[PDB]
């Protein structure tokens, strides 16, 4: 495809028509011959455009097909829930997989369930159990304190609570991230390099970010999920993936990042005092949670950046902001990360 345009095609057609006969000499607007040739040339132009677009699409498809580099789909949210009892147990109670967890908070009516069985020992006061959202996508990223019901109906349960907001739920992968990971694949075809170790650690979809800390004869791979945790199963999966990529004869170790949990209590004043209510508080809390969770590894919290993020919600409606638990910026090391803890807002 040479990317012709309509005017040149029409001019070429008219020129050849004139050359082939001297009788036809009326190619003004509104003439039959001009209209016919215009229509033909326009169809050719549309054919050329769509051919170019289809070739671009087919290049992407051939890249996908040749390496079997399938695009990653939407990921279901997952997290952990805390459960407390009246008194320490005597029976080693059994909790099978499929035990449903729900929330009375109607704003977040999503359901959760356990994919693995758990056992609570005798003389134990609480248990942490990992749960997975039934529905895929972002809808499972509930805030902290949402989950407060267990459907098993056991009488021993005192209370149920998820101590942190879920974030692992995400929609389908974007084009830019797909191309980025394809570049990582190409770079990591050479197995033994640092970038290749980083790719192998990132080969697991659940891993969000990786920092490869390097020493003489020792490698430390700091890895974390979307929530900043690193479960033992995920650590083993990362190790198994790294078996193919890590250099031979060099010690390697996998550890979770130095996650720091930030609690935020903000006093905000509102110019229009009729707008006060639960909606504005929840919206500001959601903005704060999104800002905190969007922080990557080695991202330092700056209080003024949070101030402008809160104030840009509505510069007129919001009058002033003050924090009741933060006073100075937090420095995050290369191997650390900040994640939202308990977010609270007071409207005045």
């Amino acid at each position: 495809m040479k990317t012709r345009k309509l005017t040149n095609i029409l001019s070429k057609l008219i020129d050849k028509t004139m050359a082939g006969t001297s009788k036809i000499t009326d190619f003004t607007p509104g003439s039959a011959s001009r209209s016919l040739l215009e229509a033909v040339s326009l169809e050719i132009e549309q054919f050329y455009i769509l051919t170019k677009e289809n070739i671009d699409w087919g290049i992407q498809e051939g890249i996908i097909e040749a390496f079997d580099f399938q695009k990653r789909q939407s990921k279901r949210a997952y997290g952990d829930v805390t459960i407390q009892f009246y008194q320490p147990l005597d029976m080693r109670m059994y909790i099978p997989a499929g035990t449903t967890f729900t929330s009375t908070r109607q704003e977040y009516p999503q359901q959760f369930e356990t994919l693995v069985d758990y056992y609570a020992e005798p003389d134990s006061t609480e248990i942490v159990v990992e749960v997975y959202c039934k529905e895929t996508g972002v809808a499972g990223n509930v805030p902290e304190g949402t989950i407060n019901t267990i459907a098993s109906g056991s009488s021993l349960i005192r209370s149920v609570n998820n101590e942190y907001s879920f974030n692992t739920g995400t929609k389908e992968e974007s084009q830019e991230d797909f191309k980025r990971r394809f570049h990582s694949f190409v770079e990591s075809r050479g197995r033994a390099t640092n970038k290749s170790v980083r790719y192998g650690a990132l080969q697991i979809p659940d891993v969000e970010g990786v920092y490869v800390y390097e020493e003489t004869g020792h490698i430390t791979v700091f890895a974390h999920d979307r929530n900043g945790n690193l479960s033992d199963t995920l650590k083993e999966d990362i190790i198994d993936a790294l078996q193919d990529y890590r250099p031979s004869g060099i010690m390697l170790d996998v550890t979770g990042v130095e996650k720091e949990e930030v609690n935020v209590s903000a006093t905000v004043t509102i110019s229009n005092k009729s707008r006060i209510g639960d909606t504005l508080q929840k919206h500001i809390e959601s903005v704060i949670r999104s800002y905190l969770n969007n922080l990557k590894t080695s991202d330092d919290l700056i209080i003024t950046d949070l101030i402008q993020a809160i104030m840009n919600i509505d510069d007129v409606l919001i009058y002033d902001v003050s924090f009741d638990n933060l006073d100075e910026n937090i420095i995050v090391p290369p191997q650390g990360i900040i994640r939202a803890g308990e977010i609270k807002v007071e409207l005045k």
Binding site: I24, S41, D56, G62, K179, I250
Partner: protein, 190 residues
Amino acid sequence: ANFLKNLHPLLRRDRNKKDNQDPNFALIDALNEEMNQVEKDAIESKLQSSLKTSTSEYLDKFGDWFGVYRKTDEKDDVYRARIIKYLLLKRGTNNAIIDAIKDYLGRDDIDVSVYEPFTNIFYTNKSHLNGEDHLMGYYYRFAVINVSIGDYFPVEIIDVINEFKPAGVTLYVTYDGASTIRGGAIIKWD
């Protein structure tokens, strides 16, 4: 180019003898020229869908997919060769480091070698007492390499080695000034 075949059968396909300026033949041949040219372009378009035969813009699409970008005045053949080579890079050994050094620099005849000091660790039995071996320590240690380069290099060549060397190996670079002496390096007094 089946325009004349699928045309309405009563219409003439040939320039009539009675009139050399037959407008019907002129119009039909004009349309047939465009039909044939589009067919020719569509046939040629197959070359753009293959990395082997692609050219400027589609080759740039391929290289952007592979993460390799065209340099100034870089032609299609060398560009595709560079892409293929970039996909097929060996990494994690002395040969790969030497190849990267000799590629980044403008010539291959330069003398380059990677020294491994852990070969000269003093063992009790085999190592000669006053021989070449040294006692084990920080430098004479495994996961350490010293690269000798007999040519002027930018400091960014170290970063280049960082792209190729295996993770967990300390890197040292030695500049051999003998190789870069102009002409014969032996100095004379008599």
